[PDB]
Amino acid sequence: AQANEDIVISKTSLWKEMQYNRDITIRFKFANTIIKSGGLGYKWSEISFKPANYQYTYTRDGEEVTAHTTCSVNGVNDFSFNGGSLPTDFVVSKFEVIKENSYVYIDYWDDSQAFRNVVYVRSLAANLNSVMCTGGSYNFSLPVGQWPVLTGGAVSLHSAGVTLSTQFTDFVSLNSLRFRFRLAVEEPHFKLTRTRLDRLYGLPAADPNNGKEYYEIAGRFSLISLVPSNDDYQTPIA
Amino acid sequence: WGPGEINDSTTVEPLLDGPYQPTTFNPPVDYWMLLAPTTPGVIVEGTNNTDRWLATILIEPNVQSENRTYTIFGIQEQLTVSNTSQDQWKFIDVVKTTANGSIGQYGSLLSSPKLYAVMKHNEKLYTYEGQTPNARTGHYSTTNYDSVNMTAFCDFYIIPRSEESKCTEYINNGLPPIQNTRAQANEDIVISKTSLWKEMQYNRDITIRFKFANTIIKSGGLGYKWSEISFKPANYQYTYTRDGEEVTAHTTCSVNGVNDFSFNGGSLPTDFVVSKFEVIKENSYVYIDYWDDSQAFRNVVYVRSLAANLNSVMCTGGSYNFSLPVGQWPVLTGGAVSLHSAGVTLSTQFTDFVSLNSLRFRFRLAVEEPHF
Amino acid sequence: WGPGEINDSTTVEPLLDGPYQPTTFNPPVDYWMLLAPTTPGVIVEGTN
């Protein structure tokens, strides 16, 4: 119920704007957990994705960069392929599948002077080269009968802008950054086993690594921010 | 100014209702019922249990005219049945009169793909017939015998009214049932010269108006087989009286930390089947955004810090019901969570050369003593 | 900087029981089967 007031905390200062251009690469990977439902032999509940943090190492003009990255997915489509109703059927709750209506919400962190410099950023554009993602295989164990395997899945990637976010607590400030991505479906399909409905488009949630090393993407930086600099009174009348 | 949202919900694509237990039914009016057989013989017994006692027989190929006992209703009954071709099955119909009634010989269909679906419409049982190339329909003189009760003897699928074209296509072809089928330099260029900047501490009396947006959608089935109870963001416009000037604002809402359940109350096609049932609990997050118009809010960018002392508020729920034409309906009543202030974050979008921002407000929640 | 985001915490724990189909069954080892009818007459039928 108090009134309006404006209070200053300290006096004026000098500020400079500077373009930043760095050659960059990013390392990329998924993660998964398989939480099955309780039951006798044929029960599955969740096959979904989780984020994780990683460390890596680059080279640029003879300088080392330790990295920190984390992966997540936005707008993931969901399926539930019913396997029947009998106590030995493939009753299942939740499958995770991706379509080009889904997005990616990965983070990216360094220790270089460039990232340390940019907090008060105006414009941040980049040119990330499109890459490929594929799928592998994952089997199941059953009391009897054959064994069903999730298999296959491929997509393309495409840049969809950058988003920066900052978390403010009662005590400290938390910086963060994301990376939106557009997905483009490819030809390999889901070779999921032991049920009728098959040959769809997208990726599964079972094998995101596929035995590969990791996922690498290269790109560029275009940045602008405000930094302190030197005075200009040295040449008052040039 | 714009919002930021996290969500995905699409559970409405089974397109196959699934196999069901063989059980005595009281099937409702004007509905389609798939007949999935295992071995030729008796499929379903359906009777008016006063006058009419109906069933049908599937027949293996290459069988000569032979009467065979079959213990329908616990009593045998013989009928001369013969087969002509060497690759197709046969379909017939039987009409009974009483407990020891006569036999009404009907039913005719050449069966390549081993499936059936023969149902009623407009107080009239419509029969089907033929062979996969250009098989067609018929009907029997069933003058409103709709009190008939089925008795399923196999596992089967169910279909509603308005897509009889697709069920005709399927009885023509059948489902595909295959289960286990198989760079350079790094420079920094200057934009322009320096600039002068000062920093200001701004405090405003803050009032926020809030209401939530909900959606209920029916899932295909018999009246209760539902999953989708979805959540939506809200959008409003507001007016404020603060220091003589008027304030306009917009606000959206979203929630993270989904706490979902399901009521799988049985397996019969009239049982209480709920697949997705979300009730929030104390360890989740709610989100609020601002599109304000104030001069102080006009200048919110390049923030060093922003604290805001808020008031804890009460949030309660209401009641809901359903309508399936049998029994007595259940009621969904409850809902109460006290809301407390929590951390506040800022996020900025970017595209081409313009920026989009959003003030995101997080609130910690708590459950109350009143019970539900 | 530090890790901040929450995509989704899918907390679905609705199962502590489950209804099944009154048909035949082959029992495996080390489990239990609950049965409770309401109609007078035999309900359980076991045969070896």
Side-chain angles (χ1 to χ4, degrees):
Chain A
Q2 293 65 31
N4 204 334
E5 79 306 346
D6 292 348
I7 177 169
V8 64
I9 199 57
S10 67
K11 297 295 289 183
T12 177
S13 71
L14 187 153
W15 284 97
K16 181 69 176 177
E17 74 277 13
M18 181 36 48
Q19 293 297 110
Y20 273 9
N21 216 323
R22 305 292 107 179
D23 300 337
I24 200 65
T25 59
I26 62 170
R27 289 215 176 85
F28 182 76
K29 165 73 201 93
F30 291 168
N32 277 149
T33 61
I34 319 299
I35 301 299
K36 84 173 72 182
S37 45
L40 61 90
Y42 302 97
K43 272 83 179 174
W44 319 100
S45 56
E46 295 79 37
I47 299 97
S48 193
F49 315 87
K50 319 299 161 283
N53 299 295
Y54 324 108
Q55 281 74 238
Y56 288 109
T57 284
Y58 292 163
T59 178
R60 167 168 80 197
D61 308 346
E63 276 81 42
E64 294 294 328
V65 167
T66 64
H68 272 57
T69 183
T70 300
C71 176
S72 178
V73 61
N74 188 358
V76 54
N77 291 272
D78 59 287
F79 282 163
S80 194
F81 298 86
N82 167 55
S85 183
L86 188 153
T88 77
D89 289 335
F90 279 168
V91 292
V92 64
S93 296
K94 181 68 173 66
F95 291 166
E96 268 72 357
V97 63
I98 72 160
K99 188 262 177 184
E100 316 160 304
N101 56 2
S102 304
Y103 292 143
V104 178
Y105 264 57
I106 56 175
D107 298 343
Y108 184 48
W109 291 351
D110 308 313
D111 49 315
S112 66
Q113 44 82 35
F115 191 89
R116 185 171 41 92
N117 180 90
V118 292
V119 58
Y120 282 104
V121 59
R122 164 175 182 83
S123 81
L124 71 165
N127 278 255
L128 281 293
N129 164 50
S130 293
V131 300
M132 295 298 102
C133 196
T134 76
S137 68
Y138 164 68
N139 189 358
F140 290 98
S141 198
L142 297 176
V144 287
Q146 315 170 323
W147 271 359
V149 188
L150 281 293
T151 296
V155 67
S156 193
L157 282 72
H158 277 277
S159 89
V162 186
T163 293
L164 188 153
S165 63
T166 56
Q167 183 67 41
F168 289 84
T169 63
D170 188 272
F171 321 108
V172 297
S173 67
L174 188 154
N175 164 37
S176 66
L177 172 145
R178 307 205 93 68
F179 263 108
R180 186 175 171 179
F181 264 120
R182 164 181 71 131
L183 278 296
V185 62
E186 295 292 352
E187 305 293 352
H189 294 115
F190 322 121
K191 280 74 176 175
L192 61 83
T193 315
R194 307 206 62 187
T195 192
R196 56 172 310 284
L197 183 62
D198 196 77
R199 307 204 42 78
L200 271 298
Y201 298 81
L203 276 296
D207 196 355
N209 192 1
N210 297 321
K212 277 78 175 177
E213 189 275 331
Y214 283 140
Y215 273 79
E216 311 260 359
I217 302 94
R220 286 294 271 252
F221 290 151
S222 63
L223 278 71
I224 180 59
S225 188
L226 275 300
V227 300
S229 66
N230 195 1
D231 204 313
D232 279 25
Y233 293 170
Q234 294 79 252
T235 180
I237 303 297
Chain B
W1 294 99
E5 208 279 336
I6 189 66
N7 200 302
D8 189 328
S9 309
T10 187
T11 71
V12 70
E13 58 275 6
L15 71 87
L16 291 178
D17 289 331
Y20 264 90
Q21 183 180 2
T23 308
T24 81
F25 292 166
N26 50 356
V29 62
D30 63 358
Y31 183 76
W32 296 135
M33 152 56 88
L34 188 153
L35 294 174
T38 306
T39 184
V42 190
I43 297 89
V44 174
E45 178 67 28
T47 180
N48 183 32
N49 65 7
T50 72
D51 292 330
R52 272 72 176 178
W53 322 77
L54 277 296
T56 181
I57 294 300
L58 175 52
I59 303 100
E60 280 98 340
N62 282 320
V63 176
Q64 57 92 34
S65 294
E66 169 189 10
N67 270 263
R68 284 291 321 101
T69 69
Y70 297 107
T71 185
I72 295 91
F73 292 161
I75 50 174
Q76 70 90 24
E77 200 61 40
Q78 284 210 313
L79 264 179
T80 295
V81 291
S82 180
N83 297 65
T84 75
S85 164
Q86 274 63 40
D87 285 280
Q88 271 70 28
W89 287 264
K90 180 67 174 66
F91 182 76
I92 62 170
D93 175 76
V94 176
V95 176
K96 215 196 185 189
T97 317
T98 177
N100 46 2
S102 58
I103 297 89
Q105 188 43 248
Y106 308 97
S108 296
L109 193 152
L110 200 70
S111 298
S112 299
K114 200 185 170 286
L115 73 165
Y116 293 101
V118 176
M119 284 73 74
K120 72 159 293 307
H121 162 250
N122 266 354
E123 62 271 354
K124 193 82 162 300
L125 171 53
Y126 290 169
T127 68
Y128 292 167
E129 52 88 25
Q131 165 58 225
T132 61
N134 296 115
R136 290 192 75 257
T137 186
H139 59 92
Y140 292 158
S141 89
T142 67
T143 72
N144 205 310
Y145 305 154
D146 301 335
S147 315
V148 62
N149 313 112
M150 295 298 102
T151 48
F153 308 141
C154 295
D155 291 331
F156 42 97
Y157 290 65
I158 62 170
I159 296 90
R161 279 284 104 172
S162 77
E163 69 275 17
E164 68 273 24
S165 58
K166 272 69 56 187
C167 69
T168 55
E169 295 140 29
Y170 292 165
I171 189 56
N172 183 0
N173 291 318
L175 79 165
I178 45 177
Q179 303 289 104
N180 54 1
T181 72
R182 307 312 306 139
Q184 58 254 22
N186 309 265
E187 81 295 334
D188 291 331
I189 53 177
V190 60
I191 285 306
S192 67
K193 314 332 301 173
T194 185
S195 293
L196 282 72
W197 295 75
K198 304 183 51 43
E199 69 276 16
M200 294 299 291
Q201 183 67 41
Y202 287 118
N203 292 357
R204 303 290 177 279
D205 219 342
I206 299 314
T207 61
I208 180 57
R209 300 288 182 268
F210 174 41
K211 190 176 221 156
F212 156 61
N214 179 14
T215 51
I216 190 65
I217 304 94
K218 171 253 182 165
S219 299
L222 272 297
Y224 206 86
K225 272 61 60 182
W226 294 337
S227 79
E228 48 195 297
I229 49 174
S230 49
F231 290 72
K232 294 298 185 294
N235 313 301
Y236 293 99
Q237 279 76 18
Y238 297 129
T239 65
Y240 284 139
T241 61
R242 164 159 74 181
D243 293 337
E245 52 86 20
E246 192 270 350
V247 177
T248 43
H250 318 280
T251 289
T252 193
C253 64
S254 297
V255 59
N256 206 323
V258 294
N259 297 295
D260 194 79
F261 296 114
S262 167
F263 194 110
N264 63 6
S267 64
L268 188 153
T270 198
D271 298 354
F272 292 165
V273 189
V274 173
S275 300
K276 186 264 183 183
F277 182 76
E278 161 68 54
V279 176
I280 196 66
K281 72 174 183 290
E282 85 297 342
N283 70 325
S284 294
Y285 285 3
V286 76
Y287 296 89
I288 301 299
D289 297 331
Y290 292 166
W291 299 337
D292 298 0
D293 187 74
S294 163
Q295 202 44 59
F297 178 81
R298 186 180 296 276
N299 192 0
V300 57
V301 71
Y302 305 127
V303 64
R304 181 182 211 81
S305 296
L306 72 164
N309 189 359
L310 274 299
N311 199 278
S312 189
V313 299
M314 185 64 72
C315 285
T316 182
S319 314
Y320 187 45
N321 56 1
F322 318 104
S323 282
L324 199 154
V326 76
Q328 198 38 63
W329 298 326
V331 188
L332 264 289
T333 300
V337 162
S338 78
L339 196 56
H340 291 85
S341 179
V344 159
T345 175
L346 183 63
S347 85
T348 177
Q349 184 63 256
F350 182 76
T351 176
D352 180 29
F353 274 113
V354 298
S355 162
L356 283 83
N357 304 340
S358 310
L359 277 296
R360 186 73 72 110
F361 283 40
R362 324 209 298 164
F363 306 77
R364 201 201 41 81
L365 77 166
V367 293
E368 289 81 358
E369 179 72 6
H371 296 285
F372 300 120
Chain C
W1 55 267
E5 202 271 338
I6 193 66
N7 188 359
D8 180 279
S9 67
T10 301
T11 52
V12 190
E13 277 70 35
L15 73 165
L16 73 164
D17 62 358
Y20 292 164
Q21 298 86 6
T23 66
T24 184
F25 182 76
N26 59 4
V29 65
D30 284 327
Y31 267 99
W32 293 97
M33 181 305 297
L34 189 49
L35 183 63
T38 184
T39 306
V42 64
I43 192 65
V44 54
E45 297 87 38
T47 293
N48 191 0

